[PDB]
Design an enzyme around this catalytic site. Sequence first.
Site, PDB file in Angstrom:
ATOM      1  N   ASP A   1      -4.256   7.054   1.314  1.00  0.00           N
ATOM      2  CA  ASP A   1      -4.633   5.738   0.821  1.00  0.00           C
ATOM      3  C   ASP A   1      -6.168   5.841   0.994  1.00  0.00           C
ATOM      4  O   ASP A   1      -6.646   6.487   1.944  1.00  0.00           O
ATOM      5  CB  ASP A   1      -4.065   4.644   1.733  1.00  0.00           C
ATOM      6  CG  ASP A   1      -4.308   3.238   1.180  1.00  0.00           C
ATOM      7  OD1 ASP A   1      -5.485   2.816   1.116  1.00  0.00           O
ATOM      8  OD2 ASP A   1      -3.321   2.571   0.799  1.00  0.00           O
TER       9      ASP A   1
ATOM     10  N   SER B   1       3.871  -9.815  -0.495  1.00  0.00           N
ATOM     11  CA  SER B   1       4.855  -9.377   0.476  1.00  0.00           C
ATOM     12  C   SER B   1       4.612  -9.900   1.895  1.00  0.00           C
ATOM     13  O   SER B   1       5.419  -9.656   2.794  1.00  0.00           O
ATOM     14  CB  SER B   1       4.889  -7.848   0.498  1.00  0.00           C
ATOM     15  OG  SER B   1       3.676  -7.324   1.023  1.00  0.00           O
TER      16      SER B   1
ATOM     17  N   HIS C   1       0.805  -1.205   0.000  1.00  0.00           N
ATOM     18  CA  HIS C   1       0.000   0.000   0.000  1.00  0.00           C
ATOM     19  C   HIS C   1       0.841   1.260   0.000  1.00  0.00           C
ATOM     20  O   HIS C   1       0.607   2.171  -0.798  1.00  0.00           O
ATOM     21  CB  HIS C   1      -0.921  -0.003   1.228  1.00  0.00           C
ATOM     22  CG  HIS C   1      -2.183  -0.776   1.017  1.00  0.00           C
ATOM     23  ND1 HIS C   1      -3.386  -0.165   0.736  1.00  0.00           N
ATOM     24  CD2 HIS C   1      -2.405  -2.107   0.924  1.00  0.00           C
ATOM     25  CE1 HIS C   1      -4.293  -1.085   0.470  1.00  0.00           C
ATOM     26  NE2 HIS C   1      -3.724  -2.273   0.575  1.00  0.00           N
TER      27      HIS C   1
HETATM   28  O1  LIG Z   1       9.727 -11.464  -5.157  1.00  0.00           O
HETATM   29  C1  LIG Z   1       8.944 -10.518  -5.210  1.00  0.00           C
HETATM   30  C2  LIG Z   1       7.653 -10.658  -4.711  1.00  0.00           C
HETATM   31  C3  LIG Z   1       6.784  -9.575  -4.758  1.00  0.00           C
HETATM   32  N1  LIG Z   1       7.192  -8.348  -5.302  1.00  0.00           N
HETATM   33  C4  LIG Z   1       6.233  -7.223  -5.393  1.00  0.00           C
HETATM   34  O2  LIG Z   1       5.378  -7.181  -4.241  1.00  0.00           O
HETATM   35  C5  LIG Z   1       4.140  -6.575  -4.654  1.00  0.00           C
HETATM   36  C6  LIG Z   1       2.982  -7.478  -4.224  1.00  0.00           C
HETATM   37  O3  LIG Z   1       1.769  -6.722  -4.204  1.00  0.00           O
HETATM   38  P1  LIG Z   1       0.340  -7.432  -4.404  1.00  0.00           P
HETATM   39  O4  LIG Z   1      -0.715  -6.395  -4.387  1.00  0.00           O
HETATM   40  O5  LIG Z   1       0.413  -8.321  -5.584  1.00  0.00           O
HETATM   41  O6  LIG Z   1       0.189  -8.387  -3.114  1.00  0.00           O
HETATM   42  P2  LIG Z   1       0.373  -7.901  -1.588  1.00  0.00           P
HETATM   43  O7  LIG Z   1       1.789  -7.697  -1.203  1.00  0.00           O
HETATM   44  O8  LIG Z   1      -0.526  -6.581  -1.386  1.00  0.00           O
HETATM   45  O9  LIG Z   1      -0.339  -9.053  -0.718  1.00  0.00           O
HETATM   46  C7  LIG Z   1       4.175  -6.447  -6.180  1.00  0.00           C
HETATM   47  O10 LIG Z   1       4.536  -5.117  -6.561  1.00  0.00           O
HETATM   48  C8  LIG Z   1       5.261  -7.458  -6.550  1.00  0.00           C
HETATM   49  O11 LIG Z   1       5.907  -7.086  -7.768  1.00  0.00           O
HETATM   50  C9  LIG Z   1       8.492  -8.204  -5.802  1.00  0.00           C
HETATM   51  O12 LIG Z   1       8.869  -7.128  -6.265  1.00  0.00           O
HETATM   52  N2  LIG Z   1       9.365  -9.297  -5.755  1.00  0.00           N
END
Ligand SMILES: O=c1ccn([C@@H]2O[C@H](COP(=O)(O)OP(=O)(O)O)[C@@H](O)[C@H]2O)c(=O)[nH]1
Length: 445
Positions: A115, A273, A17
């Site tokens: 946000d 994440s 976020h």
């Molecule tokens: O190995 C990784 C795993 C995740 N991400 C980034 O982590 C974010 C994940 O956001 P998403 O909304 O898909 O899931 P959240 O983290 O909110 O559960 C995205 O920008 C992914 O590209 C990354 O850069 N490398």
Amino acid sequence: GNNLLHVAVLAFPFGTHAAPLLSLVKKIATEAPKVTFSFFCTTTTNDTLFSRSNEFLPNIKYYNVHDGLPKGYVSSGNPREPIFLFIKAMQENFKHVIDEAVAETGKNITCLVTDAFFWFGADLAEEMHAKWVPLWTAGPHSLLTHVYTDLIREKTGSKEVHDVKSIDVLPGFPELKASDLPEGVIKDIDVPFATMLHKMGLELPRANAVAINSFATIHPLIENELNSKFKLLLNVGPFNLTTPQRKVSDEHGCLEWLDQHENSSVVYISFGSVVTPPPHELTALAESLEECGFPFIWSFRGDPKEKLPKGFLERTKTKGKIVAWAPQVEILKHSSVGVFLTHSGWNSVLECIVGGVPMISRPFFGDQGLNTILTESVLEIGVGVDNGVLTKESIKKALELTMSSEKGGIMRQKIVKLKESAFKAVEQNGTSAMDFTTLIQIVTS
Ligand SMILES: O=c1ccn([C@@H]2O[C@H](COP(=O)(O)OP(=O)(O)O)[C@@H](O)[C@H]2O)c(=O)[nH]1
């Protein structure tokens, strides 16, 4: 804007976020060097966000906001506890620090970018005689679901509340079960997170403009409703195309490794994440993996053997990779990758649409359910694992289907045309560049 304008940016500390919001802010600050941008978030989130080197845009300063945790507090059970504690004291904790930034700069806040979760932005903007511009960091269909919270509840009885009968909530969208909806809309309506989302739905029409990390092609009909509920709706995504933010890091040569592979042959794995499948799942995947042959890249979560089997680790160290953090956006743009095993968080989704890769979805929390239904049944660029759980049978079923000789191809086709709309939407001529330009104008005046 002028040197008298001061923009307060309130970011949500959990999930993906804060980073998307900061990205939006960096794009704006570059266009408006004389405008002061104050970024508020928890110390721990700021530490992760502002460790970047020369990424020091001079007109952006971060401020730590109290995380709501009492003195001495210790982990305890559920990981929801710190989120609930933050939410419970966030309004006053944000205000206290916003007040320090005003006294220090000598400039009253002229615009409050937040946000969308921060429903109290209208009240805060009101007090300071400032504008309020919230950013919904997820999809249009979930935003509208929250705006429709009362409507849904009013048309929800014992049947629907228990998945017996489905609810018709969104225009141009399949009928859903209560289990499809984000926690809070119809269930646990009383917890802080659920109350926060409901209030947001109610307060958003008071905003000067509502921005969203999405593009107009995602869901026409949903957008039209949203467009009628707000004073202004601005599609400013996909952020991976409309905003900066580096992160082209490949500490493990994934892209090079991807080079030494062919087309649609690698399986990228990432569940966000914060998530990590349950024990029976990981073990079901790890094995599913070294039994399918399919080369792959898996973004675990720092911990290696900690959860993963020792043997498995050094047995597949030749047909697949496992990293703590991967260069996902780039990986998703690589011709090598053939399927994306994801939890369907919105950011990962926009990144996959731009990369043009098919998806395998095992949703966990929040809007992931609606996102799966959006990409599986409305965009048709993906499919969900059986039962929404990870079992060797459900995995292979999905991999085989996407890596098939038909369905997988079509999905890849459908998402290539969507990818085309995305790139078109960001040309100076497209609706996203244009709504972004408007956003900049509002925020910097
Ligand atoms: O190995 C990784 C795993 C995740 N991400 C980034 O982590 C974010 C994940 O956001 P998403 O909304 O898909 O899931 P959240 O983290 O909110 O559960 C995205 O920008 C992914 O590209 C990354 O850069 N490398």
